Design a protein around this nucleic acid. Structure first.
Lengths: 100, 263, 158, 206
RNA sequence: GAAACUGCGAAUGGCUCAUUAAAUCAGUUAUGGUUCCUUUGGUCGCUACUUGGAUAACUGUGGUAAUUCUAGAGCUAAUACAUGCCGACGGCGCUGACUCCCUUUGUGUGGGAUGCGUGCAUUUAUCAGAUCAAAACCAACCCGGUCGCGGCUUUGGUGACUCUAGAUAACCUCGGGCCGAUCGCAGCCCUCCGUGGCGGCGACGACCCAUUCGAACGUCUGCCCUAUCAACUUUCGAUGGUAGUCGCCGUGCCUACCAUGGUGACCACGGGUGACGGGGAAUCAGGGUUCGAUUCCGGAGAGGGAGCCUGAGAAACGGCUACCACAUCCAAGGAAGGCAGCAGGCGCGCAAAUUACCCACUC
């Protein structure tokens, strides 16, 4: 699956901008490509449209279905320990525990 | 510009009756928002530092209050700029002493020590009467206290007595002629006398005439009269000089004759 | 008098209602409208023509939606070409302290005059009290009219 | 943006005034609601002090009072017929205070017929007998006919309404502010108000 | 206990005097024409032994010459975000199958199966608000008594309300009003052996009254020079009326229709000011003349104009967006900016100090 990328000059792609060009948008709290420094801040800044072309610096991709072959390192390596749950109903839902 | 409320006070702008010096500083304590008006209170820091002298700096006041030693109207207060005012009681249980705020006859708060059985009640002037939902009657006092189910004889301008452990009404004095009062604003501030006439105007201000123990006469707007006793006798103990306001020539002559101030 | 609905919207007093039940009156009839009116306070008296009248005026002190508060003033009626409003003149002396002498000055007020006063003339004396702002330039409303302390309308027998 | 100040305009004498300061936020104004007939669409705005205000863009239904009978019920709004302030407001069907409107007569007719035990909106026997006669006549032990003199001796309605009920529509007046409350709500026209607006409606077009 | 999320503050303080002549400002009065974080006092009972999913710090992989630029992937919390019972419905009004008693109906009764609504806020309509002076007949009776006479009763308040409280018919905001799924100390009393609870001290939070701190709008009287400024304003709203829109609220504040007004020799309208207003300062027999950018109080403004987010409070500039004037970096694609704060520099001119030390004092 295609998950995004960066332009030349490093500008990110974002979903919903239906072009191969870059554009300037007034961003606000809750959009990607911005992080507000104050409550209620908005800033106007450059972003890239959704369509893939030869121009990109990098494409981001995620494997949604594995083949029969193994890709070296990327698909050989077994999963790490992660971190366990902390909300009480979450612990019951993981181990199928009774309400008592 | 002024885009919202202010939170500082310059020392030459502060109330005259606090008696602050000219040269230690630019600022004065801004009284905390509370039961009494900014012009009509005494901040707790000025009482502990400047009047009683238990502390030499504002930090020595802060570490008296944070130990929970100071009670106002029987409640512990940790705020150093809390707005105490007229008829309030301050108790200091660790040193074993009690005070009430009353005006000196020159128009400033005296220190006035009281016995522990007199530290159990205060006197309150009535500001408002109204009826709420389900027909329940309400009362409002000069110090923001709200009371439900007052006695239906208690009217505007009357004085009520309350016990501090429960906050409920015990007894009251009617506003009428021949009762004893104290003056709480204007040029006559801190004088005591009996009410002798009320003159009224429809729109604008009513005027009350008051008579002294020595037979002098004075007047003020009705908003400045506080009743303190039925007939001739007060319900509270009174400070040295008893509100008599002697003139500068009488004050000179007693100061020479009595030889007080280590003469 | 016989008609008052001269406007594009129907004219009535608020707080008055007419029952559409028990409507029978026989060969004759009586007033379908009771009248709303009030006391102003300050020792003024409500005119008979406000109680016995049929006019609609929302800015009226006696029969409309205004509160009389603050200053009470007087002046001389001097112009009345507007409708339900008049102009009055106020004259005074100003002291100039370098000299020991006075200077004559005047100001004008636009004021609201209701029906119930209907025989006012230029040179009559009028008493007024403050209201909320009633229009752009109007802040005062007529409480009493007189021609005491002066000569008659026509001859001395008036 | 839009503002409601007094200082942009001239004094009693006809003389100009110069600006004292820039525009302040407490001098603000906003665009009009222009409420239409249609299925409910309401939007809300934050106002000075942090309170909320409701603005109705479309309304289909309201609450109306028949003050003569002490009856009020939720009712459909059909059309607008007169506006004292401007004719473009009836040409474009916009709803505002003291506008004159047509409403569904049905819930008042159903209250009356079940309260008085008499017909109201009926033309001929084919719209009386075949159904719902059992609203009017039932077994009523010691409450059958004569005890309804408490009803029947005060039942007669005004001729101007009995002519409206047969067409299925009543005239009414809007008393709420729909652009400020979110509601369209008012009272049924009666008596000399009904005579006044029937003359004005007829004299404009008819 | 670093970091990060959440809460609060950043609208005060400090700097300057450009604009501004009934404007600002001062004394005097008013909200019965409005809003109000916090403090202080009222008020706080029409799956439930505890619900849902999802992100930051962190771990891991990157893009651009460049910034307090940020993208894709793997984990996990709540007083963040979103749901929602239990307990204490037993309300009281309206309907009225049937039933009982004096009188078949009507009219006086007492029961009564069964339905509907039923806290405070919100929008609209309706009702009641009690008091006064004097008799004589008639229907039916309160009541003392029996087949014609004596005697009466019910929120509060203002100079003044279309006030406050009460009753009736409906509405109701939902995703878009309240009625606690929260945190910390000491432990308890028992049809009681760790159970049913009830409870001591709090902390934090939220709808509504009243306070406190204010803010906003309005009343009366008060101003330097000028006629080589004598008439001015007016659907391009000028003055007023009726209905409405918008707004925290009164109001030509704005819109439609209508009227023809409003100010001036007691100086309007126009122009000037090396004009911010006041407390005040210099000089002075008595009366005066001149000054007040400047430590206290009020106003205005952050290069020039305009627009707007967040919030109880801003039309904010140590917030944001654009045009106009300046101007810094670049890999020429792009990115960033506002000392009339404290020190310091250039320019100007007769003309004005150190890029020092500290939160000990005052707040």
């Amino acid at each position: 699956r295609i998950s995004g990328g960066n332009d030349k000059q490093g500008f990110p792609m974002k979903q919903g901008v239906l072009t191969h060009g870059r554009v300037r948008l007034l961003l606000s709290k809750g959009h990607s490509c911005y992080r507000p420094r104050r409550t209620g801040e908005r800033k106007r800044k450059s972003v890239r449209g959704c369509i893939v072309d030869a121009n990109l610096s990098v494409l981001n991709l995620v494997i949604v279905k594995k083949g029969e072959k193994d890709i070296p390192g990327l698909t050989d390596t077994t999963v790490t320990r992660r971190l366990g749950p902390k909300r009480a109903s979450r612990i019951r839902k993981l181990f199928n525990l009774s309400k008592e | 510009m002024a885009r919202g409320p202010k939170k500082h006070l310059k020392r030459v702008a502060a109330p005259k009756h606090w008696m602050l010096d000219k040269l230690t500083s630019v600022f004065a304590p801004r009284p905390s928002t509370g039961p009494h008006k900014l012009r009509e209170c005494l901040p707790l820091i000025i009482f502990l530092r400047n009047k009683l002298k238990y502390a030499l700096t504002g930090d020595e006041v802060k570490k008296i209050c944070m130990q929970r030693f100071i009670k106002i109207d029987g409640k512990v207060r940790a705020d150093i700029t809390y707005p105490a005012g007229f008829m309030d009681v301050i108790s200091i249980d660790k040193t074993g002493e009690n005070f009430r705020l009353i005006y000196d006859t020159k128009g400033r708060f005296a220190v006035h020590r009281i016995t522990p059985e007199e530290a159990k009640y205060k006197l309150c002037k009535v500001r408002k009467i109204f009826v709420g939902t389900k027909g329940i009657p309400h009362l409002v006092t000069h110090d923001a206290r709200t009371i439900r189910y007052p006695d239906p004889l208690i009217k505007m301008n009357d004085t009520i007595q309350i016990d501090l452990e429960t906050g409920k009404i015990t007894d009251f004095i009617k506003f009428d002629t021949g009762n004893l009062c104290m003056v709480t604003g204007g040029a006559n501030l801190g004088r005591i006398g009996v009410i002798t006439n009320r003159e009224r105007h429809p729109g604008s201000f009513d005027v009350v005439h008051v008579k002294d123990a020595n037979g002098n006469s004075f007047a003020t707007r009705l908003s400045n009269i506080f009743v303190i006793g039925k007939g001739n006798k007060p319900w509270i103990s009174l400070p040295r000089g008893k509100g008599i306001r002697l003139t500068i020539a009488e004050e000179r002559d007693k100061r020479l004759a009595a030889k007080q101030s280590s003469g | 008098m016989a008609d008052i609905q001269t406007e594009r919207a129907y004219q009535k007093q608020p707080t008055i209602f007419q029952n559409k039940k028990r409507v029978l009156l026989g060969e004759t009839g009586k007033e379908k409208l009771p009248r709303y009116y009030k006391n102003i306070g300050l020792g003024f008296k409500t005119p008979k023509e406000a109680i016995e009248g049929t006019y609609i005026d929302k800015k009226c002190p006696f029969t409309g939606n205004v509160s009389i508060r603050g200053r009470i003033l007087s002046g001389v009626v001097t112009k009345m070409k507007m409708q339900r409003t008049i102009v009055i003149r106020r004259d005074y002396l100003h002291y100039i302290r370098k000299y020991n002498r006075f200077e004559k000055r005047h100001k004008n007020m636009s004021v609201h005059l209701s029906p119930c006063f209907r025989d006012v003339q230029i040179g009559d004396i009028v008493t007024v009290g403050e209201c909320r702002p009633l229009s752009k330039t109007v802040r005062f409303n007529v409480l009493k009219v007189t021609k005491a302390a002066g000569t008659k309308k026509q001859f001395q027998k008036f | 943006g839009i503002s409601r100040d007094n200082w942009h305009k001239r004094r009693k004498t006809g003389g100009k005034r110069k600006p004292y300061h820039k525009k302040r936020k407490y001098e603000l104004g906003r665009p009009a609601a222009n409420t239409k007939i249609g299925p409910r669409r309401i939007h809300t705005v934050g106002v000075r002090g942090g309170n909320k205000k409701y603005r109705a863009l479309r309304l289909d239904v309201g609450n109306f009072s028949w003050g003569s009978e002490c009856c009020t019920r939720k009712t459909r709004i059909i059309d607008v017929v007169y506006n004292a302030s401007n004719n473009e407001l009836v040409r474009t069907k916009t709803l505002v205070k003291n506008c004159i409107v047509l409403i569904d007569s049905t819930p008042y007719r159903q209250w009356y017929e079940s309260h008085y035990a008499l017909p109201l909106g009926r033309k001929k026997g084919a719209k009386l007998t075949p159904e719902e006669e059992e609203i009017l006549n039932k077994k009523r032990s010691k409450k059958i006919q004569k005890k309804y003199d408490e009803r029947k001796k005060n039942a007669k309605i005004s001729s101007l309404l009995e002519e409206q009920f047969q067409q299925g529509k009543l005239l009414a007046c809007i008393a709420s502010r729909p652009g400020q409350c979110g509601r369209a709500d008012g009272y049924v026209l009666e008596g000399k108000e009904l005579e006044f607006y029937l003359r004005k409606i007829k004299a404009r077009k008819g």
